[PDB]
Amino acid sequence: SNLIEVFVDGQSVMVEPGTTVLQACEKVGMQIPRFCYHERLSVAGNCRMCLVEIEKAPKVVAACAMPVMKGWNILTNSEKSKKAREGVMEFLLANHPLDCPICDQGGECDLQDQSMMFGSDRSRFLEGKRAVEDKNIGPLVKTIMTRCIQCTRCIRFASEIAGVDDLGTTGRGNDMQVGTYIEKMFMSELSGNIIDICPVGALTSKPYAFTARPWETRKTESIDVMDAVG
Amino acid sequence: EDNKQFFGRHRWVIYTTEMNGRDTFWDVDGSMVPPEWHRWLHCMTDDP
Amino acid sequence: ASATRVIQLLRNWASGRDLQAKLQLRYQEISKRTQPPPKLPVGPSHKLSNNYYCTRDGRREAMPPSIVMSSQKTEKKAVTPAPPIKRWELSKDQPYL
Amino acid sequence: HPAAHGVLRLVMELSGEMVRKCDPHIGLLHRGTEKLIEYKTYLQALPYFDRLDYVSMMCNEQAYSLAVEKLLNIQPPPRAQWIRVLFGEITRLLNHIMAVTTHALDIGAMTPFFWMFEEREKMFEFYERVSGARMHAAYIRPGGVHQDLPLGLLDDIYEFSKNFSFRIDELEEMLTNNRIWRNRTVDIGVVTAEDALNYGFSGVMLRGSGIQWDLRKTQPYDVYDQVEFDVPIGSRGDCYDRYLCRVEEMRQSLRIISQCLNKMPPGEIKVDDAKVSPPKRAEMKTSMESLIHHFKLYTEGYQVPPGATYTAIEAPKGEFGVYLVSDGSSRPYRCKIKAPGFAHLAGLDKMSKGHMLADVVAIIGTQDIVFGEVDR
Amino acid sequence: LKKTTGLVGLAVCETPHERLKILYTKILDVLGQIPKNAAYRKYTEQITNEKLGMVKAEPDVKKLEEQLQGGQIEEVILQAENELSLARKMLRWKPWEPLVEEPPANQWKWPI
Amino acid sequence: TRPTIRPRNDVVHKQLSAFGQYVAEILPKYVQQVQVSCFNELEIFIHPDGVIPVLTFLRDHTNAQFKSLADLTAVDVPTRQNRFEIVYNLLSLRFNSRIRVKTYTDELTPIESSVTVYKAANWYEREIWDMFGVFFANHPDLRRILTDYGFEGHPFRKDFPLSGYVELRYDDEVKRVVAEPVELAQEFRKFDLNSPWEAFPAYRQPPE
Amino acid sequence: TYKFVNMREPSMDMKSVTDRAAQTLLWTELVRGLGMTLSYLFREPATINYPFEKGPLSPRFRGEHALRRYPSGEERCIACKLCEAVCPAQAITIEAEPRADGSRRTTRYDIDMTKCIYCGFCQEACPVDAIVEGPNFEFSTETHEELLYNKEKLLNNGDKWEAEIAANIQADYLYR
Amino acid sequence: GTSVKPIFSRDMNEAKRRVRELYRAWYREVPNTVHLFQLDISVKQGRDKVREMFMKNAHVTDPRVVDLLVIKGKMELEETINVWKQRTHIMRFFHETEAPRPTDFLSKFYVGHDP
Amino acid sequence: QLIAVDEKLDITTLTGVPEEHIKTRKVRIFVPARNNMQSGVNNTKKWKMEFDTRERWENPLMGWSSTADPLSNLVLTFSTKEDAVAFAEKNGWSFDVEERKVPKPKSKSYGANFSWNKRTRVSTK
Ligand code: SF4
Ligand code: SF4
Ligand code: SF4
Ligand code: SF4
Ligand code: FES
Numbered sequence A: 001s002n003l004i005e006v007f008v009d010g011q012s013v014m015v016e017p018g019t020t021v022l023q024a025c026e027k028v029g030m031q032i033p034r035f036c037y038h039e040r041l042s043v044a045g046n047c048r049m050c051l052v053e054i055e056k057a058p059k060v061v062a063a064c065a066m067p068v069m070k071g072w073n074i075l076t077n078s079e080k081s082k083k084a085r086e087g088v089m090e091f092l093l094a095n096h097p098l099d100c101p102i103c104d105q106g107g108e109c110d111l112q113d114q115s116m117m118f119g120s121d122r123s124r125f126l127e128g129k130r131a132v133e134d135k136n137i138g139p140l141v142k143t144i145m146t147r148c149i150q151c152t153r154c155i156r157f158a159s160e161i162a163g164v165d166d167l168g169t170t171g172r173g174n175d176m177q178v179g180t181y182i183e184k185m186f187m188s189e190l191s192g193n194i195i196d197i198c199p200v201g202a203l204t205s206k207p208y209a210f211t212a213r214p215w216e217t218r219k220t221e222s223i224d225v226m227d228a229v230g
Numbered sequence B: 001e002d003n004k005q006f007f008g009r010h011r012w013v014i015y016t017t018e019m020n021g022r023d024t025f026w027d028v029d030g031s032m033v034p035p036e037w038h039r040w041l042h043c044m045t046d047d048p
Numbered sequence C: 001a002s003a004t005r006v007i008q009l010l011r012n013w014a015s016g017r018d019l020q021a022k023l024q025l026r027y028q029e030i031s032k033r034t035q036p037p038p039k040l041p042v043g044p045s046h047k048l049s050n051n052y053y054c055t056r057d058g059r060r061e062a063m064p065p066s067i068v069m070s071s072q073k074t075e076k077k078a079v080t081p082a083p084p085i086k087r088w089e090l091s092k093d094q095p096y097l
Numbered sequence D: 001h002p003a004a005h006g007v008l009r010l011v012m013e014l015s016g017e018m019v020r021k022c023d024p025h026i027g028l029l030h031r032g033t034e035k036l037i038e039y040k041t042y043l044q045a046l047p048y049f050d051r052l053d054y055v056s057m058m059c060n061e062q063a064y065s066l067a068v069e070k071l072l073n074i075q076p077p078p079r080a081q082w083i084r085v086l087f088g089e090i091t092r093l094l095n096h097i098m099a100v101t102t103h104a105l106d107i108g109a110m111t112p113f114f115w116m117f118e119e120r121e122k123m124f125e126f127y128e129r130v131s132g133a134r135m136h137a138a139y140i141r142p143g144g145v146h147q148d149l150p151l152g153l154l155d156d157i158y159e160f161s162k163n164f165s166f167r168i169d170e171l172e173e174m175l176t177n178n179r180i181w182r183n184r185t186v187d188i189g190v191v192t193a194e195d196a197l198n199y200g201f202s203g204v205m206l207r208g209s210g211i212q213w214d215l216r217k218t219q220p221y222d223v224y225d226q227v228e229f230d231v232p233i234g235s236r237g238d239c240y241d242r243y244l245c246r247v248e249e250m251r252q253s254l255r256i257i258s259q260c261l262n263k264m265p266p267g268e269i270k271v272d273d274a275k276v277s278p279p280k281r282a283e284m285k286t287s288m289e290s291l292i293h294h295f296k297l298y299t300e301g302y303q304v305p306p307g308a309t310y311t312a313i314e315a316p317k318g319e320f321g322v323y324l325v326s327d328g329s330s331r332p333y334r335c336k337i338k339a340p341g342f343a344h345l346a347g348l349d350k351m352s353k354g355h356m357l358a359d360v361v362a363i364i365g366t367q368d369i370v371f372g373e374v375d376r
Numbered sequence E: 001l002k003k004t005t006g007l008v009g010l011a012v013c014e015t016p017h018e019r020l021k022i023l024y025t026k027i028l029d030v031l032g033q034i035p036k037n038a039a040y041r042k043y044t045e046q047i048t049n050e051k052l053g054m055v056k057a058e059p060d061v062k063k064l065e066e067q068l069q070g071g072q073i074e075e076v077i078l079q080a081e082n083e084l085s086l087a088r089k090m091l092r093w094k095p096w097e098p099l100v101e102e103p104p105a106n107q108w109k110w111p112i
Numbered sequence F: 001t002r003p004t005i006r007p008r009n010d011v012v013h014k015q016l017s018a019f020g021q022y023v024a025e026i027l028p029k030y031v032q033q034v035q036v037s038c039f040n041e042l043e044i045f046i047h048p049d050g051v052i053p054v055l056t057f058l059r060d061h062t063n064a065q066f067k068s069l070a071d072l073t074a075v076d077v078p079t080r081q082n083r084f085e086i087v088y089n090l091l092s093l094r095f096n097s098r099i100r101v102k103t104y105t106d107e108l109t110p111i112e113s114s115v116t117v118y119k120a121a122n123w124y125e126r127e128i129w130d131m132f133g134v135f136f137a138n139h140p141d142l143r144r145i146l147t148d149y150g151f152e153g154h155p156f157r158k159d160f161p162l163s164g165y166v167e168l169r170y171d172d173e174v175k176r177v178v179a180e181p182v183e184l185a186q187e188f189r190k191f192d193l194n195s196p197w198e199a200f201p202a203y204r205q206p207p208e
Numbered sequence G: 001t002y003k004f005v006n007m008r009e010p011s012m013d014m015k016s017v018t019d020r021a022a023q024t025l026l027w028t029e030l031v032r033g034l035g036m037t038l039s040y041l042f043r044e045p046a047t048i049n050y051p052f053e054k055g056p057l058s059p060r061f062r063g064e065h066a067l068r069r070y071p072s073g074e075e076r077c078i079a080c081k082l083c084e085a086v087c088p089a090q091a092i093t094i095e096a097e098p099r100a101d102g103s104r105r106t107t108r109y110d111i112d113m114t115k116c117i118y119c120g121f122c123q124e125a126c127p128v129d130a131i132v133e134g135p136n137f138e139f140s141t142e143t144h145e146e147l148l149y150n151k152e153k154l155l156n157n158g159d160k161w162e163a164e165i166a167a168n169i170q171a172d173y174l175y176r
Numbered sequence H: 001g002t003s004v005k006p007i008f009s010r011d012m013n014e015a016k017r018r019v020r021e022l023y024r025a026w027y028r029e030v031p032n033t034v035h036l037f038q039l040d041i042s043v044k045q046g047r048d049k050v051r052e053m054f055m056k057n058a059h060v061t062d063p064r065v066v067d068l069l070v071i072k073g074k075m076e077l078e079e080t081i082n083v084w085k086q087r088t089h090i091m092r093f094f095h096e097t098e099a100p101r102p103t104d105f106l107s108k109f110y111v112g113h114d115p
Numbered sequence I: 001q002l003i004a005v006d007e008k009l010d011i012t013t014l015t016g017v018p019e020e021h022i023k024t025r026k027v028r029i030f031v032p033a034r035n036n037m038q039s040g041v042n043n044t045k046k047w048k049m050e051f052d053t054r055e056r057w058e059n060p061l062m063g064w065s066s067t068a069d070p071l072s073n074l075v076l077t078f079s080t081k082e083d084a085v086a087f088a089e090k091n092g093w094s095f096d097v098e099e100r101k102v103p104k105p106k107s108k109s110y111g112a113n114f115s116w117n118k119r120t121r122v123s124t125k
């Protein structure tokens, strides 16, 4: 075939050309940590959590965006990859608000879980944190933008899936903010999905606010009947 | 208080005879002690 | 103790020991019920550098047990699970009660 | 029955007052603890071991913590280990007081019970000062201890320990040389070394038959290899020798307590690993990582790497063990509790052969049975 | 000579050298009926020959106890009796044969 | 590594590996696997027919002398064809060592009783029969030990509900304690605690 | 290292034999036991005059539960439900919603005091010091239902014991 | 072949024999149980209940399952004979306090959601 | 020597389960769906067996949730679908088996964000 041979921790994998390092790792049951990457959205490569070491290469690569070359040996659990993950989580948590008890994402937060699995256990940040003002985008999505990690998942979803170009980024540097820049509402038939893709509690469900925690809910797999899509 | 008594007998309370609504000349109990004197009386602090 | 000296002497004679030396009632030798605040030092991982968690991650160094003699797959002296236990020695403090 | 510890149904076939057969019926205190553990996290499962043997609480806590730490591949800090050994010896003092005095009460000497329960009350005060609970401290946790010692606790422990020996002396004056006590205890419930080994006995029930075995000496844990003490050994395998062994074990526990008081080091009290041990409250309210780790340790708990361990300690009643099976999650897959009382009471019929009613009462007293650990 | 062994039910054995020699000879004679290539036969014969050689070369009981590392030759005698009984049982069982059966495919796989 | 990490012991690991090889060589008929864990514990997985020989060998052999039966219990894994895992824990005082012997069975296949090897097994076997329903052949007196009289089912099985099927109360009409189907004023609240992110890469399984 | 407890031989001289015979005939060790009891008779008893005198406690003592407030009177609880998650006995039941001012507060906070094991894990898990185990321990009831605490009962307990609770927390918080 | 180890009986005939011996033992024991426990039922009621408990399992065709059922029944009989059971344990076989739950569709529909 | 039974496994008479909770229960065998709030997939590896949901009602005294069926919290874990089916069949439970859903492989290309003529070109980063 046209498949090429790569290695994940020395294990041989036959992959199609154009496969990224992250996909090749997932072909062997290894999930690379990620924040900005979603398999149904366009690649962004800005969160830098997917950084991984390729053998005989001095610099780590973004596993979500870098196509894997033939013969590459992806070292997913080397010291380089672990230290890169710890550094990226340190930077992510430097300015994050201490809002876990009041955050609806608590218990189902990718930031929490990936800090517990791939980050360190303490903080050496001795400064004051940044705080941003909230945006009103409608009665469905509650917005607390101090928790935002600027993964730009909402922007990509709104632009590509929902077809609405009303979200974006304003400013630059540490003051770059996600929003609409005007008092505008993100009312779309698919808008609520931006709550799901957001890894943090920056975008939460307003009707669901404060009522439950994830561990106490029972999950019933069922079918929607509001339309004929099923 | 009496610091010459051993630990346990060195602090005590003579209860009142008339609490909120009931006659307590004979019917006394430890729940009548208010929280501040409760802390003093149970030796969780050395200060009245 | 507030006992009179004659009753104290009777107690010592009946017990056969000096009772006043070791008393069960602990009048005043005990610590104060109000104490100064502590400072409570921190552990060895409270450092600002050279403190990456991947170098002090005890949970991630656990590994599945080593397999000896799977069935699926000379001199050869006999062995014991460990060297024989050494005979205990009599106490020098008080070998016999 | 005053001698049945409340939950023992001993069905006895008797010829006159001579005991022909003892059939112990247990499970009157079976609460299904081991099945309940499978629905709790490891920290949530910890307080069950307090109620397993409610005469030796911190020893069961220590056994469970050692098993979990072995499975986690972590190390408690040295000060935590010294505190653990100190409070374990205090717990041994409590357990041996209860055993000896309830044994004497069962025979009929009811006076030493009152003398020694004041000492038990003082050690309960120590427990409460260190944890806020008189019995069910939950103080010893995987990773170390919950809180550091309050200021002045060591001085009070020293004050108690410098006087406990005279209380032991008074108890010994009452019981050891009394001819009624020897008539009731000498040559009663004699068990041989080979039978004791084959019947699964441990602790004093072994050492009363001359078997030189102590888990604190042969397979030490925590800082037990840093303290000096003697192991009392019996010669006749009867109730009297086991009574003497327990009294001398109390004296050796006093010796170990003195060494622990004089060798307490400084430092932290739980492992400096926030993925296992919760951070201090000040850090949780200041640092993002500390708050996240507090949240996750108190909601989900820590995941334990998959594997099975059998971890045992020399509890005051014998070898106390846990077979702990972890499937990789934060909830234990299996927890089997090994209690010395189970095997000791299993051999009650064997040790009662050729004896009378009061002899069987004395044998039940000398086996040192608590049914929370027997039934679980 | 020795007043007591210190273990309840374990009697002091007069003439332990003769008893040990008899027991080791019996163990060797029983092992002689086991196949030569059986690991149990060769291992037990090796250790039995070592202990018998130690017994034949030391007339002092305390020094023989120190050499044997077996704990007070009365328990050494008991261990020899246990070994003889086990040898007879093992001759009955024939555990040197190949494996009876393999376990199912995932019988020992953990986790799950 | 340093302070927060439990140290290793290579000497004990090598000794346990050597003794496991020894036992496997001596009894090829029954031994199926030998393992030494990272915290220095030796496990021997045997065929069910070898329960009596292997244990006997571990008790009476001069080089083993595992004279104490510390614990005997069962583990229930419903996904296995042989549901129940029978675990023996043995202590050798002569060599100051511990060993584990593991075998397997299902709901209908009896296991040989070990009371001829260790008397202490008696109650333990009873408990297994009480708690999991595993039958032990040639047990001198096999019956329930922990559960109530007439109790149906085996509560330590994973498919047995936590609160059981019946509960007890005193009924005054019949003037006695009666048993009725369970009703709970507050139902036990199930928690979903497992994180969706992998914790230990060393134990990762093939993707099948 | 070990010692023997019962391995001493009595001397067989005439003096020792006569001493033992006099012990048998005149009951000297029984008189020693009587003397020990008589000595205890004249000692001061260890009894305290309850309820007028109380046993000593600690700032760490775990007693009746209470819900605390900020100095402004606002509730400290924010319905994070950590105490409910950590409770080994499932004694806590919590329901919450946004308040009329948009605040994160509970609408139900019940503790089953006949399910509680009084372990203190809830006050460890609390990040705002909202739920505590107070110093009170004398709250026996006459009916079972009185021991099923709802949010009003716990808030009343906090308002009633705050003076002692704050002092105990001030004494203890540097160990936590 | 299916290579299964027996418990007691090779096939179903010896299993039926063991069932008959257990039934004989229970049938003999019932009057003694009525007298000793001081029960208000008659011997006919107890023997009918024994028959009902035996017929509850009349559909079993596996000799090993039958052997285990006989073992459990012998355990129950040994419990009853030695007065290890109490009157409540024996009377639990009769469900005298539980109200009779209807079987037809309409009554279940009226009462609740259970099928 | 063996006896060679030739009948399918059935242990309903030995488990002590009441009749109502055998013939009236319906167990679902399925690989749980990924929680859409998170990207981790570690909870979608094993098969689960669960029971049908029965009635829960409010307790009159406290408003707590009350249940009457004892199998409401029972969840079993299996490594393969066939193991769960065998367990259900030997325990006498009627079951519905739902096939495992795996996300399909997807063609990801970063350069497609900057296409010369295709619509995949992005207007923002
Ligand atoms: S988004 Fe996650 S980490 Fe941030 S406050 Fe909410 S729960 Fe905590
Ligand atoms: S609001 Fe959420 S999805 Fe949007 S950029 Fe911020 S973290 Fe990402
Ligand atoms: S003290 Fe323990 S059992 Fe009681 S409510 Fe708090 S956490 Fe739950
Ligand atoms: S009492 Fe504390 S832990 Fe419990 S819900 Fe309220 S804020 Fe959270
Ligand atoms: S996942 Fe690759 S940089 Fe964010």
Ligand SMILES: [Mg+2]
Pocket: A105, A194, A195, A196, A197, A198, A199, A200, A201, A202, A203, A204
């Ligand atoms: Mg979100």
